[PDB]
Design an enzyme around this catalytic site. Structure first.
Site, PDB file in Angstrom:
ATOM      1  N   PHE A  64       3.488   1.534  -2.249  1.00 23.25           N
ATOM      2  CA  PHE A  64       4.250   1.632  -3.459  1.00 23.25           C
ATOM      3  C   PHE A  64       5.323   0.535  -3.544  1.00 23.25           C
ATOM      4  CE2 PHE A  64       7.079   3.529  -6.585  1.00 23.25           C
ATOM      5  CZ  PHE A  64       6.188   4.201  -7.427  1.00 23.25           C
ATOM      6  N   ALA A  86       1.843   6.392 -10.738  1.00 22.49           N
ATOM      7  CA  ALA A  86       0.829   7.230 -10.136  1.00 22.49           C
ATOM      8  C   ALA A  86      -0.460   7.108 -10.861  1.00 22.49           C
ATOM      9  CB  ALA A  86       1.272   8.666  -9.962  1.00 22.49           C
ATOM     10  N   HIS A  90      -3.921   5.542  -9.017  1.00 19.45           N
ATOM     11  CA  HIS A  90      -5.158   6.306  -8.978  1.00 19.45           C
ATOM     12  C   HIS A  90      -6.291   5.750  -9.782  1.00 19.45           C
ATOM     13  CE1 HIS A  90      -2.007   8.477  -7.013  1.00 19.45           C
ATOM     14  NE2 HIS A  90      -2.945   8.657  -6.069  1.00 19.45           N
ATOM     15  N   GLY A 114       0.066   3.528   0.114  1.00 19.56           N
ATOM     16  CA  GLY A 114      -1.016   3.124  -0.792  1.00 19.56           C
ATOM     17  C   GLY A 114      -1.873   1.973  -0.212  1.00 19.56           C
ATOM     18  N   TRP A 137       4.365   7.802   4.028  1.00 14.59           N
ATOM     19  CA  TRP A 137       4.824   8.784   3.022  1.00 14.59           C
ATOM     20  C   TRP A 137       6.011   9.677   3.423  1.00 14.59           C
ATOM     21  CZ3 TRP A 137      -0.476   7.516   2.686  1.00 14.59           C
ATOM     22  CH2 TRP A 137      -0.917   7.060   1.431  1.00 14.59           C
ATOM     23  N   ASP A 145      -0.701  10.503  -1.189  1.00 14.35           N
ATOM     24  CA  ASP A 145      -1.605  10.379  -2.266  1.00 14.35           C
ATOM     25  C   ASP A 145      -2.545   9.236  -2.054  1.00 14.35           C
ATOM     26  OD1 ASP A 145       0.192   8.446  -2.936  1.00 14.35           O
ATOM     27  OD2 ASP A 145       0.373   9.072  -5.028  1.00 14.35           O
TER      28      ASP A 145
END
Ligand SMILES: CC(C)(COP(=O)(O)OP(=O)(O)OC[C@H]1O[C@@H](n2cnc3c(N)ncnc32)[C@H](O)[C@@H]1OP(=O)(O)O)[C@@H](O)C(=O)NCCC(=O)NCCSC(=O)c1ccc(O)cc1
Ligand SMILES: CC(C)(COP(=O)(O)OP(=O)(O)OC[C@H]1O[C@@H](n2cnc3c(N)ncnc32)[C@H](O)[C@@H]1OP(=O)(O)O)[C@@H](O)C(=O)NCCC(=O)NCCSC(=O)c1ccc(O)cc1
Ligand SMILES: CC(C)(COP(=O)(O)OP(=O)(O)OC[C@H]1O[C@@H](n2cnc3c(N)ncnc32)[C@H](O)[C@@H]1OP(=O)(O)O)[C@@H](O)C(=O)NCCC(=O)NCCSC(=O)c1ccc(O)cc1
Ligand SMILES: CC(C)(COP(=O)(O)OP(=O)(O)OC[C@H]1O[C@@H](n2cnc3c(N)ncnc32)[C@H](O)[C@@H]1OP(=O)(O)O)[C@@H](O)C(=O)NCCC(=O)NCCSC(=O)c1ccc(O)cc1
Ligand SMILES: CC(C)(COP(=O)(O)OP(=O)(O)OC[C@H]1O[C@@H](n2cnc3c(N)ncnc32)[C@H](O)[C@@H]1OP(=O)(O)O)[C@@H](O)C(=O)NCCC(=O)NCCSC(=O)c1ccc(O)cc1
Ligand SMILES: CC(C)(COP(=O)(O)OP(=O)(O)OC[C@H]1O[C@@H](n2cnc3c(N)ncnc32)[C@H](O)[C@@H]1OP(=O)(O)O)[C@@H](O)C(=O)NCCC(=O)NCCSC(=O)c1ccc(O)cc1
Ligand SMILES: [Ca+2]
Ligand SMILES: [Ca+2]
Ligand SMILES: [Ca+2]
Ligand SMILES: [Ca+2]
Ligand SMILES: [Ca+2]
Ligand SMILES: [Ca+2]
Lengths: 269, 269, 268, 269, 268, 269
Positions: A64, A86, A90, A114, A137, A145
C-alpha cells in the site's frame, strides 16, 4: 503512454514495472489502475504471449502507498481513501488471476503487504537472492487483503500461511523456495536477465494451452473430480481441433523430440 | 481373461499392470476399459484388500496412446477418437478415486501425461529411483486432463502445480518426494519387491477404515469443519459397532500400543 | 475451578493444560467439556489475547480416553459412549477453529488420534524435540475423526495426509516440520519457556487483526477470489476505522513495518 | 443414420425423438448413445440453433428400458447391465445440461423415471395436456438417479422435490405448471405444432447469448455473487465485441424496444 | 449533493431514487457510482435503519444507459465503455446484497436488464400494478449480467429463470407475485405511500437482527446445515448479549411475539 | 421412559410428541435432548420405518422455551443458558435432517421460531387448517437460527424466505401450501387421523430407497451434476443388488401395476 508505471511490449512479453523506487515501489492508486489497464491490453494483444510483473531497481513492491492516506481529514478521510484504493488493489489482483495470459512475477527485491499479494496472485514466481517477503499488515494495523486469504494457503498450506501472517516474520529466499512460494532463486546480478529469458519463453509457448491450464487450476481447487474432468475434456476437444495440434502429433510420431522444456527455469541458487 | 492389461490377485492384492512395453506402456482405449473393470471387480472381491497399479518392464505409463489416433479421417476422425478415449480415460481416473479400496501406484518408470494423472489419482504412491514424471500435454499440443486440475494442486499446492504444467520439465524422484508427489523412492532393483510388500500390508490393514479415510479426504478438502465432522462421526459410530473394534480395544487395554504401524514403509533412498 | 484440566491465565494468555498424565493425557469427556468452556471464557475475556494448549508433563495428548469406555453394557453401551464422546470432542475441535482468539498448540510430547486432531486444529503449532505424532485410528480400530478430514490435508496436502493415516506411521519432529505440521522444533528442556514467550507475544499482538486473518484463512480455502476479497475489504475498512490504526500509521509515517510481531526462535 | 431414435434437422432445430412407442418410449442403451451423439453433433452444426427432445406417438419417455435387463445371468447379470446402462444414461443427461445449445423438452405424454430426468435436465419444458410425470424409481425398487438429485429441487424447491420422490404420485399438467416443472401446457392436438414453432424461435434467437445464459445459470446456482459477476462480465465484454451487437444497438437507438420477445409462448391451457 | 440520483433521508430511511426519467431511468455510469456511495453512507449512518430504492416518475429502471455508449471510437471504444460500465454496475449490485442495511426495492414501474438486476438484488420487493419486468439482454444483444446468474434462480428457481431470460418475455405483476419476484402488488395511485410505510417500518425494525438474517440467507444457500447453524448460533449469542434483548424478553414475559414487525398490505 | 416428550413406536412409526401444551409446546432443553435420543433410537430400530413429529393438543411448537431463561443471574446467565439450549436445539435440528429415516412433520397447530425450524428440517410436512407459521425471532429480539438460514430458502426461494423473516408476518395454511412450506392442509378434526395414516404409509415404504433420496437431495443442492450422478449411480447399483429389487421388476413385467402411490396424501383442503 502510462505515467505511473513502467511498461513495454517486446519479444511477446508485456512487461509491467512497478515504479516508485524512492518509496520502495509501493503502489499508488493511479499506478494500480494502470497495471489493470496494461493487463487488459495484454490480453487483447495478439502479439503478447505472457506478462511480466517486476519492480524498478531493488525493490519489488512495498505494498500500500501509505503516503497517499489523508491525515488532513479525520477517520472518514482515511476510510474514504482506503475504500478507493481497496477497490483498485482488488481489481488489479483479480485481473492477475483472471487474465488470459500467463503472468510471471519477477521478484527483484522486497515484497510487502500488497506486494506479497501480487507475487501470490501470479502464475509463476521467481526471485533474486536479495529479495524478501513480509506480510506487514499486522504491523501497520490493517486487516490482510490483496487476496491473501485466497492465494497464500493455496500455495503454502494453511499452517504456513497462518504463521507468516501472525508472526509478521520476514521470509527469505531459501525458505520461500522451500515453501513453494517461489520456484527458483537467482543471484541478484543475474536476475534481470534470467527473468527476462523465462518471460520470453513463457510468451513463446502456446498461450491457448497455458490459459486452459491456468483457469482449470484456479477452478479445480474447489471442484469435485467429475466436474473437473468435464471442463478438462472440453479443453482437450478444443485443443485437438486447433491447428496447433496435428503438427505436434506428427512430429512425435516422426521421431522429433524436444531437447528442452517448454519453459526453462535455470537451477539458480 | 483381460487382453490388454496384466492382472492378478494374490495375497489380498489386485495387481493391475499397464502393459504395452514396446510403446512405453501408453494406455489404449481397450486397456483403459479393462483397468476400470478390474477396479470394479476388486471392490466386489472379499478377498481383495488393496489394489496396486504398475507398469510392465521399465516404464510406468506414457499416457495417451498416440499411435491409435486415426490419421486418414480428418479433424473429425481425430476429434472422434479423442471423445471416445477421453470418456474412457476419465471413467478410469474417476474409478481410481472413487473405488472402495486403497490404490497404490507403484511407479516403476516414467509416468507422463495420463500416466502422471494415474499416479496422482491413486491413494498412495512410491517409485523406483529410475522413475520420472512429466506433464507432456503441451508438448504434444493437447489441453491437460486426467484430473490434473483436480489432483495436482491438492498434492503439491497451486504454485508447483502451475509450474510443472507450464514448464513441462521432467521431475526426478528426489524432487518428486520433496514435493509430496511420492512418499518414498527405492532402488530400481529392489522396487518391485518392496512395492509388493507394501501392497500386501495395505491389503491386510482394515479396508473399512481405509475406505472411510479415503472418501473423507476427498470430500473434506471442499467442506467446512462442521460438515466434515458430521460425516466423520457417522464413520466413528459405524466403526465401533463393527466387529473389528472390540478386539482392538481389548488388546489396547491389555497393553498393545496404538502406535503400531499398519504399513511399514522402508526408508528407501 | 476446573476439575479435569489445568488452567492458567497469565500475561494475557489463557493456558489450557491437558492433564491426565497417568494415562498419557487422553481426553476424558469431562475434560473436553472444560476445554470448550475455557475457550469460550478466553474469548469473553478482554484481558486474554491468546490461548495456549498444552499437555501435562511429557505428553501432549494420547487422544480418546479409551479407559472410559463402558464394557459392561454390550455393543450398545459402547456405541452410546462414543456418541456422547464424539459430541464433546467435536464441539471442542470446532471451538478451537472458530474461537475468536489465536490458539497456539504447544506440543510438549506425543500427540495421537484426537491429540493430533487438536494439534491440527490450532492456529499455530510448535513442538519439543521429544514430540511425535501418530494417527492411531487405524490400529485402535476406529474411523478417523476430530476434523482430520478437514485439517490434515489443508496443512500437509492430500498425499501426505492419506499416507499418514493409512500407514499409521509415527512422525518425528524433523519430518513434521518439513511437512508444515509444526513451524519450529525446540529442545525438550527449553520448550515450555519458549512456548510461553511465543504465547505472550501472540497475546500482545493485535487480537482484532489476528481474528480477521484466522477467519479469513478458514473461509477462503473454499472460496473464489472475488468473494475472498470482498470479505478481506470489509476487514480492511473495519480496521482503518479502529483506534489502533492511526497510531501505527502515524508511527510508520514518523519513522518507526517489517518488525516481527511474534518472534519464533529458530529452534532445532 | 441412427437406428434407435428419430432425428431431423430443419429450420435450425435438431429434433431428437425418443422412439420405442410399443414400450412407451422407454430408452434403450443403444438409443441413449445415439441421443448423446446427436447432441454432440448439434453443438457442432452451424445450422442448428436449438435442440428439441420429444417422444414418438403419445408417450414422452417411460424411463429405464426394463425389458433389456438380463434375467438368465443372476444378480451379476443384473448388476452388469445396470452399470452399463447407468453410464450411458448419465453421459446423456450430463450432455443435455452441458450442450452448447438451448434444449427444449417437448413433453407430449408420460415422462417417468429417466423420462422425467430428461425433462428436468432440459433448458425449457412445455407439455401437452395429456402429459404426466412420475418418479417411478421406488415402485420399480431402484434408487433414484438421472440427475434428479441435481435438477428437481433446483426447479421445484426441496420440499416438493422430496414429496414427489417419496409419494411416487403422478403429477398432472396443471400442477406441473404451478410447480415450475413446465412453463406452459397445450392441448394435445395443437401441441406438436406449437412446440415446433417454439423450437424454431429458440433456434433463431442468438445462440451465443443463450449458451452464456445457460452455463451461467447452472454455475451460478452454486457460486457467490462476486464470482458470478466476474463470469457474467466476461460474457458481456465478449458479446459487445461480437458482430451481433452493434446492429441491435443501432435499432434500439432508432426506436426499436428491447422488450421485443425472442420467443413467443402462446398462453396454452 | 448527488448530481445523478435523487436522495432523501427521512424517518430513518435513506431513499435512493433512480432518476433519468427522460430515458426511462436507465442508469448512467455517474449515477451508479452515486448509488453505491449512497449505500455506503446509509450503512455508516446510525440514523438510517433502511434503504429504499425506487425510480423517478413512472419507471423503475430501464437498465444500461445505452445512450452513453460511444459510437465514434469503433469497437474498442464500445468495449472500453462497457468495461467501465460493467465495473460500476457490479460494484453497485454487490453493494445492495452486501450492504449492512435492509434494502427495499419499490418498483414503481418497468424494470429491464440491469433494472431487473437491481430488483433481484434487493432484500425485499414490492411493485405498483403498473410495473413490469423484462430481461432485455437477449434483444439488445448483450450477455446477461447484474448478478442475474446469481439472484434470479435463487428467487424463482432454475426453470423460470431460464425461461424468462431465453424468451425475453415480459412479466406482469400478477405473475411476478406468483413467481416470488415481488411480495405484494399495489395500485399505481397508492404505491408510493404504501412503499414509504413499509420502508419506515423496516427502518424501525431492529437493524442488527435484520443484518444477521440477510447475511445468513445469502451465505446459507450454499452451505451444509452444520456450518449454517454455527453461524446462526454465533448470531444468537451476540443477540442475547445485546441491550435490545432483555427488554423484549422481559416484555414477552410480562404479557406483551407473533406481532408483525413490518406490515405488508395485502394490496392487489 | 421419556419424561419430557410423548413417544411411541407403533405400526412402524416412531411418533415423537412435543409436549408442553400449557406453554404452547415450546421446547425445553431436556425435551430437545430426548427428541435427539428418540431419533437416534428410531434409526437403530429395525421395526421403525419412519418418524412423525407432532405437537400435543392444539399447538405444534412455540419454539424456544423462554421461561427457562435465567433472569436471576445477569447477562452472563442469559448467555450461558442460550449456549446450552443452542447446542441442543441444533443437535436436534441436524438430526432431523441427517437421520436415516423419513421424518414427517404433522403440524397440528402453531409453529413459531424453533418450531418453524423443526417443520422446515423435516422431510415431509402437512398441516391442520388451524395451524399457522411465524418466525418470531425479530420480535423476541433474538437472531434467527434452527437452520432457518439453510432450510427456508431451500424450500421457498430466497425472496419469500427473506420476507417472512423480515416482516415477522404470520403465514396461514393456504399461503404455506402455495409456498411449498406444506404439501397439504386438512380439516382440524381429521388431521390426526390423516397424518397418522400418512406416517404409516411412509414407514411401510422401502426405507433404503427413501434414505437414498433424502441424503442425495440434501447433498445434491450444492453439488455439480457430474458429482451428483456418481453418488446417484452408487445408489442404483446398491439398489439393484438388494433383495427388494427383483421382485419389483418381475411384478412389472408380469403385468402387476400399483393402484395407488407409495404414500398417499389425500387432497385435503
Ligand atoms: C519495505 C520496507 C520493509 C523496506 O524498509 P527499508 O529498506 O529499510 O526502507 P525505508 O523504510 O527507509 O523506506 C524508504 C522510504 O520509502 C518509504 N516507504 C516504504 N514503504 C512505503 C509504503 N508502503 N508507503 C509509503 N511510503 C513507503 C518510507 O516511508 C521511506 O521514506 C519498509 O519501507 C517498510 O516496512 N515499508 C512499509 C511496508 C508496509 O507497511 N506496506 C503496507 C502493508 S499493508 C498493504 O500492503 C495493503 C495493501 C492493500 C490494501 O488494500 C491494504 C493494505
Ligand atoms: C515416455 C517417453 C518420454 C519415453 O522416452 P524414450 O525412452 O526415449 O522412448 P521413445 O521415445 O523412443 O519411445 C519408444 C517407442 O514407444 C512409442 N511411444 C512412447 N510413448 C508413446 C505414447 N504416449 N503413445 C504412443 N506411442 C508411444 C514411441 O513412439 C516409440 O515407438 C517418450 O516416449 C515420450 O515422450 N512419449 C510421449 C509422451 C506423451 O506426450 N504422452 C501423451 C501426453 S498427453 C496424455 O497423456 C493424455 C491423456 C489423456 C487425454 O484425454 C489426453 C492426453
Ligand atoms: C500414546 C502411546 C503411543 C504412548 O506410548 P507410551 O508412552 O508407551 O504409554 P503407554 O502405552 O505405556 O501408556 C501409559 C499409560 O497410559 C494409558 N493410556 C495411554 N494412552 C491412552 C488412551 N488413549 N486412553 C486411555 N489410556 C491411555 C495406557 O493404557 C497406560 O496405562 C500409547 O499409550 C497408545 O498407543 N495409546 C493409545 C492411543 C489411541 O489409540 N488413542 C485413540 C486413537 S483414536 C482417537 O483419538 C479418537 C478421538 C476422538 C474420537 O471421537 C474417536 C477417536
Ligand atoms: C409408462 C406407463 C405408466 C404407461 O402406462 P400404460 O399406458 O398403462 O402402458 P403399459 O403399462 O401397458 O405398457 C405398455 C407396454 O410397454 C411396456 N413398457 C412401459 N414402460 C416400460 C419400461 N420403462 N421399460 C420396458 N417396457 C416398458 C410395458 O411392459 C408394456 O409391454 C407404464 O408402462 C409404467 O409405469 N412403465 C414403468 C415406468 C418405470 O418404472 N420406468 C423405470 C423407472 S426407473 C428409471 O427410469 C431409471 C432410469 C435410469 C437409471 O439409471 C435407473 C432407473
Ligand atoms: C424499457 C422500454 C421497454 C420502455 O418502453 P417505453 O415506455 O416504450 O419507452 P421508450 O422506448 O419510448 O423510451 C423512452 C425514451 O427513453 C430512452 N430509453 C429507454 N430505455 C433506455 C435505455 N436503457 N438506455 C437509454 N435510453 C433509454 C428511449 O431511447 C426513449 O428516447 C424501452 O424503453 C426499452 O426497450 N429500452 C431498452 C432497455 C434495455 O435494453 N436496457 C439494457 C438491457 S441490458 C442491461 O440492462 C445491462 C446492464 C448492465 C450491464 O453491464 C450490461 C447490460
Ligand atoms: C405461540 C403464540 C403465538 C401463541 O399465542 P397465544 O395462542 O395467544 O397464547 P399465549 O401467548 O397466551 O401463551 C400461552 C402461554 O404459553 C406461554 N408461552 C408461549 N410461548 C412460549 C415460549 N416460547 N416460551 C415460554 N412460554 C411460552 C405464554 O407465556 C403463556 O403463558 C404466543 O404464545 C407466542 O408468541 N409465544 C412466543 C413464541 C416465540 O417467541 N418463541 C421464541 C422465538 S425464538 C426461537 O424459537 C429460538 C429457537 C432456538 C434458538 O436457539 C433461539 C431462538
Ligand atoms: Ca504464451
Ligand atoms: Ca485393506
Ligand atoms: Ca492477541
Ligand atoms: Ca439459437
Ligand atoms: Ca432497521
Ligand atoms: Ca420406510
Amino acid at each position: 503512454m502510462y505515467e505511473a508505471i513502467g511498461h513495454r511490449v517486446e519479444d511477446g512479453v508485456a512487461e509491467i514495472t512497478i515504479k516508485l523506487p524512492r518509496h520502495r515501489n509501493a503502489l499508488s492508486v493511479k499506478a494500480m489502475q494502470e497495471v489493470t489497464d496494461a493487463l487488459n491490453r495484454a490480453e487483447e494483444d495478439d502479439s503478447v504471449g505472457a506478462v511480466m510483473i517486476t519492480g524498478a531497481e531493488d525493490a519489488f513492491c512495498a505494498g500500500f502507498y501509505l503516503r497517499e492516506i489523508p491525515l488532513d481529514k479525520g477517520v472518514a478521510g482515511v476510510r474514504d481513501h482506503f475504500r478507493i484504493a481497496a477497490l483498485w488493489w482488488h481489481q488489479m489482483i483479480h485481473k492477475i488471476i483472471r487474465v488470459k495470459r500467463p503472468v510471471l512475477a519477477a521478484i527483484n527485491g522486497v515484497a510487502a503487504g500488497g506486494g506479497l499479494g501480487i507475487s501470490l496472485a501470479s502464475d509463476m514466481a521467481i526471485c533474486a537472492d536479495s529479495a524478501k517477503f513480509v506480510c506487514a499488515w499486522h504491523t501497520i494495523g490493517i486487516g490482510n487483503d490483496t487476496a491473501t486469504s485466497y492465494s497464500l494457503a493455496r500455495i503454502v498450506g494453511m499452517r504456513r500461511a497462518m504463521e507468516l501472517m501472525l508472526t509478521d516474520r520476514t521470509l527469505y529466499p531459501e525458505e520461500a523456495k522451500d515453501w513453494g512460494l517461489v520456484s527458483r532463486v537467482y543471484p541478484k546480478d543475474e536476475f534481470r536477465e534470467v527473468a527476462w529469458k523465462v518471460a520470453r519463453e513463457l510468451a513463446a509457448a502456446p498461450t491457448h494451452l497455458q490459459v486452459m491450464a491456468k483457469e482449470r487450476f484456479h477452478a479445480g481447487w474447489m471442484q469435485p473430480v467429475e466436474e473437473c474432468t468435464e471442463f478438462e475434456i472440453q479443453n482437450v476437444i478444443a485443443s485437438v481441433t486447433h491447428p496447433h495440434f496435428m503438427p505436434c502429433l506428427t512430429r512425435f510420431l516422426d521421431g522429433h523430440r524436444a531437447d528442452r522444456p517448454q519453459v526453462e527455469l535455470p537451477a539458480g541458487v
